[PDB]
Design an enzyme around this catalytic site. Structure first.
Site, short mmCIF file in Angstrom:
data_model
loop_
_atom_site.label_atom_id
_atom_site.label_comp_id
_atom_site.label_asym_id
_atom_site.label_seq_id
_atom_site.Cartn_x
_atom_site.Cartn_y
_atom_site.Cartn_z
N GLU A 35 -35.99 12.69 3.01
CA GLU A 35 -35.68 14.10 2.82
C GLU A 35 -35.00 14.35 1.48
OE1 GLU A 35 -36.74 16.59 4.42
OE2 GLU A 35 -37.32 15.83 6.39
N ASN A 46 -38.80 26.45 -0.04
CA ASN A 46 -40.04 26.47 0.72
C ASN A 46 -40.86 27.69 0.34
OD1 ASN A 46 -39.01 24.18 2.24
ND2 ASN A 46 -37.73 25.68 3.31
N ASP A 48 -42.06 29.94 2.05
CA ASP A 48 -41.72 31.16 2.76
C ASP A 48 -40.44 31.82 2.26
OD1 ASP A 48 -39.66 29.60 3.74
OD2 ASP A 48 -40.21 29.80 5.84
N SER A 50 -37.33 30.43 2.27
CA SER A 50 -36.17 29.68 2.69
C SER A 50 -35.95 28.49 1.73
CB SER A 50 -36.34 29.19 4.12
OG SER A 50 -37.43 28.29 4.23
N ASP A 52 -34.20 24.31 1.72
CA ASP A 52 -33.64 23.16 2.43
C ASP A 52 -32.49 22.58 1.63
OD1 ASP A 52 -35.73 23.57 4.20
OD2 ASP A 52 -36.86 21.80 3.57
N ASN A 59 -32.69 23.60 6.84
CA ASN A 59 -33.42 24.78 6.38
C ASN A 59 -32.63 26.06 6.62
OD1 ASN A 59 -35.26 26.86 5.85
ND2 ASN A 59 -37.00 25.84 6.85
N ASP A 101 -32.24 20.64 19.69
CA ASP A 101 -32.87 21.94 19.87
C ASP A 101 -34.13 21.89 20.72
OD1 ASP A 101 -32.77 24.79 19.27
OD2 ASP A 101 -34.56 24.48 18.03
#
Ligand SMILES: [Cl-]
Ligand SMILES: [Cl-]
Ligand code: NA
Length: 129
Positions: A35, A46, A48, A50, A52, A59, A101
Site C-alpha cells: 500500500e 483516487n 473518484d 477521494s 488514500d 480512504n 467492517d
C-alpha cells in the site's frame, strides 16, 4: 517516516494488530508493503476524488475527513492528516475498524491482489518480535 520491515512489524504488534480479527502480523506487514512501501507519508488520489492516506492507504471516502471528498463519511472520526504521522497509532486504530467492517482485509485491494494466500510469514521472518 519510512519503516523497516521488522521495525514496522514490531510497531504493529506493539499496537495490538498481530492476529487482530485473525490476521497474522505478516498479513499486516505485507499490506503495508504494497500500500505504502512502508512510508507513513504516502498519499494517493483516487479517480473518484477521494484520497488514500498513510502506511495502510486508508480512504477518505469512508474513514477519515480531508474536507475535499464530497459525500464522504469519517467513520474513524479522524483528520486524514493524522494518518500520515510517524507514530502509527491512528492508522492502526482505524485499520482495526476497517478490518472489522465485514470483508476482512479484502478492504485493502492491494492485500487481496498481492498478499492474500501468499507466504505472508516471509514478511516477519527473522524479526525479533
Ligand atoms: Cl505471519
Ligand atoms: Cl476475515
Ligand atoms: Na471523508
Amino acid at each position: 517516516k519510512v519503516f523497516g520491515r521488522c521495525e514496522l512489524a514490531a510497531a504493529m504488534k506493539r499496537h495490538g494488530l498481530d492476529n487482530y480479527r485473525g490476521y497474522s502480523l505478516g498479513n499486516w506487514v505485507c499490506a503495508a508493503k504494497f500500500e505504502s512501501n512502508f512510508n507513513t507519508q504516502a498519499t494517493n488520489r483516487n479517480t473518484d476524488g477521494s484520497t488514500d492516506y498513510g502506511i495502510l492507504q486508508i480512504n477518505s471516502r469512508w474513514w477519515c475527513n480531508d474536507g475535499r471528498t464530497p459525500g464522504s463519511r469519517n467513520l474513524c472520526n479522524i483528520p486524514c492528516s493524522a494518518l500520515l504521522s510517524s507514530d502509527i497509532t491512528a492508522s492502526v486504530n482505524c485499520a482495526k475498524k476497517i478490518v472489522s467492517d465485514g470483508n476482512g482485509m479484502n478492504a485493502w485491494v492491494a492485500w487481496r491482489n498481492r498478499c492474500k494466500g501468499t507466504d505472508v510469514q516471509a514478511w516477519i521472518r527473522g524479526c525479533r518480535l
